[PDB]
């Protein structure tokens, strides 16, 4: 199903249809502050970010760059970094070798090159530097910010059709194609099909959707996903979740970032648990055992049910970096913890282990099932560390070295 | 896109291909308890439940459901109730007629309905109740109470393939079987298709995807879609969504459900919040305004960016009742909040109204965009106030009866 592409490295993380799809996120500090743009970026890769992206928008900022990496690398930290450059990335690339130097990867929107000839002058200027580095780049298409001319040329074309699309389609059109014209003109200048990722990203997920199987279609390249914009709380949650997933399921994507609005003092690391989720969710990728668990309804006998689930979740957590490290494929544990006899005996049958509570009607026993089978009844005080208990000798024996 | 399938009135919603996807949830009050599952199915209603289930377990609670049901009305709350009924649910709409009749549908699980040739009878019985009653049904299998009568037969059927499946997608072959064999036994009954949704919910995305192609092509009912035992927080949340999306996009499914684990404390609103999202974000149906947001990175000039964003979202829902109530078609409204120059004047020019703050480098000053037009730009203390009246000013006019 996954889409086949050539191999894109990011430092020394390959990206590409023969590869894990690839989590990323992006620091929102001012780039210029080395240490609170260092910290940033440990902090995310340490909560999983494989790449991290910054952005490079003035002289200042440029500068810090290289001394950034350099204290990633004094940590042992290869953490690759992708600049982020608008409307000044050939200046700062040409004024700035240590920092071209330092970054893996450079991101070129197409709507911000600037205006008219100087565009096609700007872009050249940026491949070249590139192309010298032996740096991949990712054309990163954005309809916030998308090519006028491009799109004027578009909205003539579709009113010459028999039946004009409306104008929302022809701006997915001109994003589309703002991607594909510029890495066509990538290549023809040179930049290997190993040194090329592209996006082009929308804020809607229907709309996303479109766009991408138009890329996926028209172009070879690895594709950065993401629903630019997703916003706050819940809501940017689930729309990320809900454009990423039709995508991924149809094997496209090779590397995506969560584009969420962190609330007021939530921390810059949610959105590389999202992605993480979204990837985990769609069994893609596993990061850490998961717990399946009922809603709990009328037939729960206790907040017993929801204070137990809650605190395998918690256990299952604090476990994960010992167990990382001791036990090789323990992200893959699916763990179960059930509310009643109705569906409980039969999803722990389906889980590595789980546990069915009594609910109502029912004896005081819980059931513990691992690998289908019962493996042995529960009851009274202390259930859930006996149940954590034999989650730990599971694991030892399911996935030891 | 939408998949057509006939109505089936669940009390005065109708759901089919002709209708909104309908928003349900479940209480996880002791039914019995009338005071405290009215309450409840008051609140679910209030936030979005357009449907509310509920578990009639045993006899005290086939008791209470007259009751919650004339309180209901009482109020003027006419939400469906529907029954989940399992082991005895023909014993208990037999024994319990006015809760029959009180109901507005009744679930039936053909992997709960007893033993051996006992499974035959206890459907018919509770088809025959539906039928004398005018009642709808929902056959709802979920593979944590998979038939194992049916297992086995397609376990066999299986192994006598040249090349067998393995035993998981036996187990996801045999759902949906006992899904389509109790629906086409239904009808055969002489239950009416315009009496007839429904489900058959796995703990997997993937899965879930596969299972309903399935059911969307070997069926003509409506279909109740849901993530069966999703889990807690985010997670849930995410795997909810990621499994939905690809369906619904597809044009499958006619109502919802988001199975998610409440934490300790958590409302139980917070499902159809999730539920709402997702049917939201992919532009199935519109709720409430919907705030776009940049994530914020190191071009934005201070936490005002994060607060303004906030704030934004937190008066829109302060002002929805009063809204939902003036200007017909609100809830369509899309607001942009943006951090810097990039694509903040792009996105803004997308939604109906938006703000683009400046960001590094720029003049002190935020342009505000509306139907794709520059409408004025802000300066100074004041912009969250001067905006947010803007914003009023616009649905005003916009939305306007
Ligand atoms: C900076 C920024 C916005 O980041 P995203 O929403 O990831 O979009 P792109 O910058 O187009 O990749
Ligand atoms: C009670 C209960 C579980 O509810 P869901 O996860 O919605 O699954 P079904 O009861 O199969 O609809
Ligand atoms: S397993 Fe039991 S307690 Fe949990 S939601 Fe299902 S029926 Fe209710
Ligand atoms: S609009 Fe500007 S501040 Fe917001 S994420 Fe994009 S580049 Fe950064």
Known sequence: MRRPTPTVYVGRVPIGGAHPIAVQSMTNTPTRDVEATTAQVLELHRAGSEIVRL?????????????????????????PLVGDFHFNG???????????????????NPGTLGR???????????????????????????????DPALLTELMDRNAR????????????????????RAYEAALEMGLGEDKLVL?????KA?????????????????????????????????????ALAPLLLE?????????????????????????????????????????????????????????????????????????????????????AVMGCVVNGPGESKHAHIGISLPGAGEEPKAPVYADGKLLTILKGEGIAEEFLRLVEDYVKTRFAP
């Open 116 to 146: 008219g000839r100087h565009k096609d002058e700007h872009f050249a200027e940026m491949i070249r530097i590139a192309m010298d580095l032996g740096k991949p780049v990712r054309i990163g298409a954005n309809w916030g910010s998308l």
């Open 251 to 335: 094997g496209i994507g090779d590397t995506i970032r969560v584009s969420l609005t962190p609330a007021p003092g939530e921390p810059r690391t949610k959105e590389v648990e999202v992605a993480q989720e979204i990837l985990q969710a769609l069994g893609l990728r596993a990061f850490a055992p998961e717990v399946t668990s009922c809603p709990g309804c009328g037939r729960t006998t206790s907040t017993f049910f929801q204070e137990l689930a809650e605190e395998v979740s918690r256990r299952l957590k604090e476990r994960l970096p010992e167990w990382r490290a001791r036990y090789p494929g323990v992200e893959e544990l699916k763990v």
């Open 199 to 203: 996006s082009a990203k929308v804020s």
């Open 206 to 242: 229907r709309d996303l959707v479109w766009v991408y199987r138009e890329l996926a279609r028209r172009t070879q390249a690895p594709l950065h996903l993401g629903l630019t914009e997703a916003g706050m709380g819940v809501k940017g949650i689930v729309a990320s979740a809900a």
């Open 90 to 108: 050939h200046l700062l690339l040409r004024k700035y070798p240590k920092m071209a130097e330092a970054l893996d990867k450079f991101r070129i």
């Open 55 to 79: 952005t490079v928008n003035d002289e200042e900022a440029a500068k810090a760059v290289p001394e950034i990496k350099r204290r990633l690398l004094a940590e042992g930290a290869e953490v």
């Open 161 to 180: 059709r028999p039946e004009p699309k409306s104008a929302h389609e022809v701006v997915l059109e001109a994003l589309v194609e703002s991607a594909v």
